[PDB]
Every structure is written in structure tokens, then in C-alpha cells.
């Protein structure tokens, strides 16, 4: 996958990170992101961080780790 | 790398975890951890779980994710 399974499963894009831990402006991406390359690839066609959160939704600052 | 870049770079073995956030009796790798495989597999030899905290020290207790 991209993101590990547990708490922090879900592949976001985010504007921006603070401290490897949290991800600020997370949308949820457009396409399915079968692997890294790709989820990046997405994420940084929007301007964002590809991240790995612990919702699977849009939210303006959230726990989320790097992939 | 089996850890990402970042303040969670740090690969250690612990014991157990809590929430995919905290590492639990982590220990440093008595061996050189190059790969995913190497790393799982060394920390299962001491009944352990390969995590990416945030210090490369031994501790009790720390912030850690999911590799
Ligand atoms: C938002 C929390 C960011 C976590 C940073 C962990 C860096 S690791 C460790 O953390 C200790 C506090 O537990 C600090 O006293 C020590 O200086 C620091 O090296």
C-alpha cells in the first residue's frame, strides 16, 4: 500500500505538515493511489504533501505521518 | 530507508504499541537495519515490532508510528 495499515491509514494530500505529525488543508485524493510514486505524483500536481492521516476525509489540520 | 525522513526516522524495536502513536520498551537495532524484511524480521528475534519513533535511544515510552 501507501500508507501503513492502523491509526494512520489514510492517503491524504495536505497543503503543508508540522512536525511529522500533523497535516494542515488534507483533501482526499481524486483517483485511487495504488502506489508511492503516484500518490505523490497526485498530491504534488495540487501543490500538497502526499500523507498518511487518521481520517479518510477533507480537514483543515489533522494527525497524519509521511509516507 | 525503512523509516521515512523526518522527526520519526528513527527505527527501533519495541515491545509493543499503543495506537499506532507510541512505541513501547524500544531498543535500538542491534544490527543494521537496510531493509524493510531485515529490520521486521531482527525485531521479531527479540519478540519485538520494528517502529519509527522520534529519538534513536532506547526509552520506555515514546512517540512512535508504524513502519
Ligand atoms: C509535538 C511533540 C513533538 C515531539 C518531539 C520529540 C523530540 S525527542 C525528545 O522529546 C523530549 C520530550 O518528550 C525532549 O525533552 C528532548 O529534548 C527530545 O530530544
Given at each position: 500500500?501507501?500508507?501503513?495499515?492502523?491509526?494512520?491509514?489514510?492517503?491524504?494530500?495536505?497543503?503543508?505538515?508540522?512536525?511529522?505529525?500533523?497535516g494542515?488543508?488534507?483533501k482526499?485524493?481524486?483517483?485511487?493511489?495504488?502506489?508511492?510514486?503516484?500518490?505523490?505524483?497526485?498530491?504534488?500536481?495540487?501543490?500538497?504533501?502526499?500523507?498518511?492521516?487518521?481520517?479518510?476525509?477533507?480537514?483543515?489540520?489533522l494527525?497524519?505521518?509521511?509516507?
Amino acid at each position: 500500500a501507501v500508507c501503513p495499515t492502523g491509526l494512520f491509514s489514510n492517503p491524504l494530500c495536505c497543503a503543508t505538515n508540522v512536525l511529522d505529525l500533523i497535516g494542515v488543508d488534507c483533501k482526499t485524493p481524486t483517483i485511487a493511489v495504488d502506489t508511492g510514486a503516484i500518490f505523490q505524483a497526485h498530491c504534488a500536481s495540487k501543490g500538497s504533501k502526499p500523507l498518511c492521516c487518521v481520517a479518510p476525509v477533507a480537514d483543515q489540520a489533522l494527525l497524519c505521518q509521511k509516507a
